[PDB]
Design a protein around this ligand. Structure first.
Ligand SMILES: [Cl-]
Ligand SMILES: [Cl-]
Lengths: 143, 143, 144, 144
């Protein structure tokens, strides 16, 4: 996958006891949730407070996921904050892909790529990526 | 219930789209999880990093829950940080009760009381509240 | 406070698994409310119609948001057995309903809960008294 | 990349409910991996023994931590139907196993996933090659 740019937005996730399975590490089932929380935080930072909730319910733009992939390189535990370095890697006319690197104490625990399309939210109908959103997103896509 | 002291530790919870049900508010099913995350953060702040995970796995003290109760006064949404004001309300010889007030933009959304006993973690056997923990906890119990 | 479960209680099976468990090797307390709520959702499916709260809210336009929950945890929940959630309405007033759920594994009562909801006109997010047609479905299941 | 599901695939039923859904009125993407993992856990219960991963890890001392997952989401998942998770091992090497899960609702394939685990000596959290006794259980279910 693409290496993380210096520019990446970081969303902190506090991992706890209850996120962990009997092997004493974060249950895999929760890791996509953490990544997606980071992407929502990304929208909050660069589009406006309330993340997807604001984007869907106020702006009438949905971004349903069509694909996700993650590689788990090292366990996630409550011993450190999970720093989720998050950035858009591409924006086509129909979809956007975000990268999330989940890092603990400088070790990359997981790397993920998450691809969404765009909808007119209240109609649940696909649309091309709106120009206003393209203007906000493209400055953060690395070379 | 008891009013929140000025002294209460606050743990911030970021509520998102995916925490919300089709009524556009946080699903009730997740609210106890948020409260419990705040209590774990409380242990991190006053006992040491890693919250319950550290307390159980390193200190060999478990704090299993025996009761929880919550009143939901106003909806929780992604529009604001959920500030979870958290404090111990009592510590007997066998159990501790924590209060959590979940507050958004100054409105109290929920009030909860959560009661745990103490175990020798590796034995899953009850014990009285250890003296060292009592010394850390009692300074934060309000009049 | 909490009433004993009647012979008539609806039982919803919940499969508990590895992923529900914490490092103490039992179901994390934070997941237990979810299981109890799933039971209540299944009660609605059984007595009101398939699709539980989703059907109730989106088709019938009746929401039942929670205003209180309380649970006592008596014994650990594990993946060694099905969690049998014995579920019934203990009370229906003019404005609210309270459901009891006992979570039982191999006949051991692991937790006892009481969960109180009010009623809304779903599409308006406005409170309403319990509608008469729902009252008619609910009341026959409230124990003595 | 992702192989079509065989007639032989184990099917695990997942009940999707209100609480799994987001404000767009479909299952939140973040919960879908959980459903797929539950399916894989059920596969282990079916072919290795009751209690899935919990039994595997805590009784048999074999862990199967995940090293990769990928999912394509083709159609929304809702509470209107049971989610039928068609589940099978697509591959077993010396060190890892890959499970496919197709989540199907009313015959529509809502998502297709592939999930890769390695094997550990559970109590040591140390990698090991796939044990021969598990290989013997797994291989008969790997399609052509
Ligand atoms: Cl905008
Ligand atoms: Cl200590």
């Amino acid at each position: 996958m693409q290496p993380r740019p210096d520019s990446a937005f970081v969303h902190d996730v506090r991992v706890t006891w209850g996120d962990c399975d009997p092997a004493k590490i974060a249950y895999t089932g929760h890791l996509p949730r953490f990544a997606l929380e980071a992407i929502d935080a990304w929208w909050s930072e660069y589009h406006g407070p309330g993340g997807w909730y604001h984007l869907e319910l106020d702006t009438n733009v949905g971004t349903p996921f069509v694909r996700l992939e993650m590689d788990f390189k090292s366990p996630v535990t409550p011993r450190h904050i999970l720093k989720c370095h998050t950035w858009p890697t591409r924006l086509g006319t129909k979809s956007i892909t975000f990268r999330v690197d989940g890092v603990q104490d400088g070790v990359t625990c997981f790397v993920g790529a998450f691809t969404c399309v765009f909808t007119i939210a209240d109609q649940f109908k696909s649309q091309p990526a709106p120009d206003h959103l393209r203007a906000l997103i493209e400055p953060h896509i690395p070379a």
